[PDB]
Design a protein around this ligand. Structure first.
Ligand SMILES: [U]
Ligand SMILES: [U]
Ligand SMILES: [U]
Ligand SMILES: [U]
Ligand SMILES: [U]
Ligand SMILES: [U]
Ligand SMILES: [U]
Ligand SMILES: [U]
Length: 517
């Protein structure tokens, strides 16, 4: 943390953050969500980290070079250490990236190594080559070299993500899936795990071995698993919580803007809220059904009437303000809602649906007052506008993600937030073989458009190709875009170091500080 001259620090440097839900895991290779990544950034540090404004910056790697954007060489700082005092080496990164690639690990982020195009990843994921053939090597203890199969100019931007953080081989091998228990875990970020009580709290304490420990200010941070946004706000206002999770309750938000304006932080965020359709399950394998659902949802009602927290109605998957996004707003988005409704009804009528045999299906969402209220509104809108019946189902976060991966669903609420600020951070998740493809969408045409983006060596052709890839997804109605999120949360006046300038919201508790109050 960089405490401004003149600021008086509180005697007790502790923080309590709400984290939305119980985490899937603390193992960097078994996680895929925001709550998971929030804790992961305090515990495991990769090659690069985001600074306080979100810029990719030195993590374990103090400096790096690239040759033709294909061979990346990272020079690891000599004093990088794990919490048990042992050095973090390039060998840790080699083991870690191989474990991520290995199909036996079954990481939801196995495809992150395909997104960066590390050599031999496709064959490794497919079981054709052993994970040890991955294009990574330790040239020495302090030098990690990555070899890609094609030039990727934005490659280093990927490296702040939890999936490419190092994990400690000896703990993994000795304790297997209990390696992340407090008595066994070993970490290399600014914090160490002190306590983990499922559905109660995660307590982290400062890691004295961290290389940049002298600049850490907060001594302990607690992450809570509260999925009710109302309850989060209540425990924030009671004094327990210093920073709410960044999901805000429809019940109270308008009142909060008037009551504590200075604490209501609202900043740009590269995330899209959408209804994920299971594209491989009848009748959602019919483009007419998906298109009907996409058109009949009234975003103006949802975004401006129901939620009204500053979100913008969405017509694409990639947020339009992602760096490199130059998207074409589809003609249906300019139509009137009535015109969208007629087209929708026409398509469903063409798909075989009638008043006597209507379309009925489930709408799965992770427990939350916000998603429940939005799903109830969407259900009402779809019933009224298109004559469809939906059965709402809530599931806790970890179960909910497993259901979407399993494909044991019809339509699910969804939100994707960028991992690096570039259109492929979104677009790569709709690749037929992506480990992040919970839409179960498989388009050879879409796949080809993205493969072509690194076959050209310039940004304008690349941006036009991303635009076309979005048009292909839209043409297929793979999803139902709802809104682009804003990052809205409450932060007490005494929490310093949180700018709100990072559109990825990659917060590190090592950058924060408690102002005397
Ligand atoms: U004190
Ligand atoms: U105090
Ligand atoms: U660049
Ligand atoms: U950029
Ligand atoms: U269903
Ligand atoms: U509620
Ligand atoms: U470039
Ligand atoms: U105080």
């Amino acid at each position: 943390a960089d405490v401004p001259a003149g600021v008086q620090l509180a005697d007790k440097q502790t923080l309590v953050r709400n984290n939305g839900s119980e985490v899937q895991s603390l193992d960097p290779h078994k996680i895929e969500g925001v709550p998971e990544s929030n804790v992961s950034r305090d515990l495991f540090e990769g090659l690069l980290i985001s600074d306080v404004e979100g810029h990719p910056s030195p993590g374990v790697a103090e400096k790096w070079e690239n040759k033709d954007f294909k061979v990346w060489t990272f020079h690891l700082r000599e004093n990088a250490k794990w919490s048990d005092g042992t050095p973090v080496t390039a060998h840790d990164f080699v083991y870690s990236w191989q474990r991520l690639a290995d199909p036996n690990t079954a990481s939801p982020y196995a495809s992150y190594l395909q997104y960066g195009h590390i050599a031999n990843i496709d064959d490794i994921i497919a079981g054709k080559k052993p994970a040890t053939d991955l294009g990574v090597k330790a040239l020495d203890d302090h030098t990690f070299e990555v070899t890609l199969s094609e030039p990727v100019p934005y490659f280093y931007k990927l490296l702040v993500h939890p999936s490419v953080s190092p994990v400690p081989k000896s703990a993994v091998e000795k304790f297997g899936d209990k390696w992340t228990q407090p008595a066994n875990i070993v970490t290399n970020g600014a914090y160490k795990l002190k306590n983990w009580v499922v559905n109660e709290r995660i307590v982290l304490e400062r890691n004295p071995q961290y290389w940049d420990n002298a600049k850490t200010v907060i001594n302990q941070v607690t992450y809570l698993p509260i999925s009710s946004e109302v309850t989060d706000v209540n425990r924030y206002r009671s004094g327990e919580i210093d920073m709410t999770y960044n999901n805000m309750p429809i019940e109270l938000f308008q009142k909060l803007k008037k009551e504590i304006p200075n604490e209501v932080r609202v900043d740009p965020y590269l995330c899209t809220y959408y209804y994920e359709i299971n594209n491989q399950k009848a009748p959602f394998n019919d483009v007419r059904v998906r298109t009907a659902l996409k058109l009949a949802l009234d975003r103006d009602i949802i975004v401006n009437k129901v939620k009204n927290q500053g979100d913008l109605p969405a017509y694409s998957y990639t947020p339009p303000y992602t760096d490199g996004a130059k998207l074409v707003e589809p003609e249906w988005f300019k139509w009137s809602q009535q015109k969208r409704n007629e087209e929708a009804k026409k398509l469903l009528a063409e798909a075989g649906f009638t008043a006597d045999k209507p379309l009925t299906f489930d709408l799965l969402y992770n427990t939350s007052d916000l998603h429940k209220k939005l799903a109830i509104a969407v259900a009402s809108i779809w019933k009224k506008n298109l004559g469809v019946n939906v059965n709402l189902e809530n599931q806790e976060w970890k179960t909910f993600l497993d259901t979407r991966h399993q494909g044991t669903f019809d339509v699910a609420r969804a939100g994707w937030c960028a991992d690096y600020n570039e259109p492929t951070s979104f677009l790569n998740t709709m690749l037929s073989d992506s480990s992040n493809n919970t839409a179960h969408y498989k388009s050879p045409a879409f796949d080809k458009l993205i493969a072509d983006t690194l076959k050209v060596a310039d940004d304008t052709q690349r941006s036009e190709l991303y635009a076309k890839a979005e048009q292909q997804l839209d043409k297929d109605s793979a999803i139902v875009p709802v809104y682009y999120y804003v990052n809205a949360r409450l932060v007490k006046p005494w929490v310093g170091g949180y700018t709100g300038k990072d559109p990825l919201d990659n917060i590190y508790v090592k950058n924060l500080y408690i102002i005397k109050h």
